[PDB]
Structure 1
Amino acid sequence: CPLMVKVLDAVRGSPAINVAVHVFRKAADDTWEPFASGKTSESSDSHGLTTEEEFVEGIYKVEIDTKSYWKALGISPFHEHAEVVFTANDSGPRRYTIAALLSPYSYSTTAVVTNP
């Protein structure tokens, strides 16, 4: 698939399941367009939210509700949420894997961009 948002829980060493993820495309006057949304789910090595629509050149935003994830575990995380804002400047068809490694006081996000 064209887009894969993986969310990992670094305390537990498991995919953070049931996490809300909102994907947005930038528009005129900072207007953010809703591109795709959903929640993390797994089966074998698929531990995230995937979408089928490819990414045409532009600026996208990925919102991850990391606050809600930690509250369910009785924890008040530092970050109010996780946000990944990037440019899909390669207009040609590309595959984007976006990962977020979560900890109560820290998060990491990594992107792997491959061209089929």
Structure 2
Amino acid sequence: CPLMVKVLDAVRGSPAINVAVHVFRKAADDTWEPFASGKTSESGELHGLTTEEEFVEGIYKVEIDTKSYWKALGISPFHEHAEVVFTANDSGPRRYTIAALLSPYSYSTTAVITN
């Protein structure tokens, strides 16, 4: 509902399918506590991670398991994983889409935040 992750593949020009994605919430002691996870679908999307009630303000980290993705395709990649670390803010719009565009030695990420 309030958080969606979309992952695309810049080598093949396709969604990045069956990519593991883990979301963590920063705890008061500065550790990363598991929050939600899943695998991207055939459309490269991961829906249903959280609910509005659970997704309170705070710092979150989205870890995308890019290394496993590339290796399953027979490609040696540079990065251990990709990270997206951000603050959820109630003063801004209410739906967050985190998009990532993957290449073996590079990635790009953006946020699309809408009401």
User: Which of the five TM-score ranges fits, normalised by the shorter chain?
Assistant: 0.7 to 0.9
TM-score (norm 1): 0.85
Percent identity reads 97
The offset of 1:99, in angstroms, is 0.4
The offset of 1:89, in angstroms, is 2.3
Query: Does the 8 A contact of 1:57 with 1:89 survive in 2?
Result: yes
Query: Structure 2 vs 1, CA of residues 89 and 45 (structure 1 numbering), >3 Å: closer, same or farther?
Result: closer
Q: How big is each residue's C-alpha offset from its partner over 1:37-77, in whole Å with a ceiling of 9 and x where there is no partner? A: 00000369889978676521100000000000001111111
Query: Structure 2 vs 1, CA of residues 45 and 109 (structure 1 numbering), >3 Å: closer, same or farther?
Result: closer
TM-score (norm 2): 0.86
Query: Does the 8 A contact of 1:7 with 1:47 survive in 2?
Result: no
The offset of 1:92, in angstroms, is 6.8
Query: Structure 2 vs 1, CA of residues 113 and 105 (structure 1 numbering), >3 Å: closer, same or farther?
Result: same
SS in 2 for 1:29: coil
The offset of 1:91, in angstroms, is 5.3
Query: Structure 2 vs 1, CA of residues 49 and 7 (structure 1 numbering), >3 Å: closer, same or farther?
Result: farther
RMSD over aligned Cα, in angstroms? 2.7
> 2 CA distance for matches of 1:50 and 1:7?
18
> 2 CA distance for matches of 1:60 and 1:45?
18
Query: Structure 2 vs 1, CA of residues 81 and 98 (structure 1 numbering), >3 Å: closer, same or farther?
Result: same
* Structure 2 residue ranges without an equivalent (≥5): none
> 2 CA distance for matches of 1:90 and 1:30?
21
| Aligned residue-pair number | 115
SS in 1 for 2:29: helix
Name the stretch that deviates more: 21-30 or 42-51. 42-51
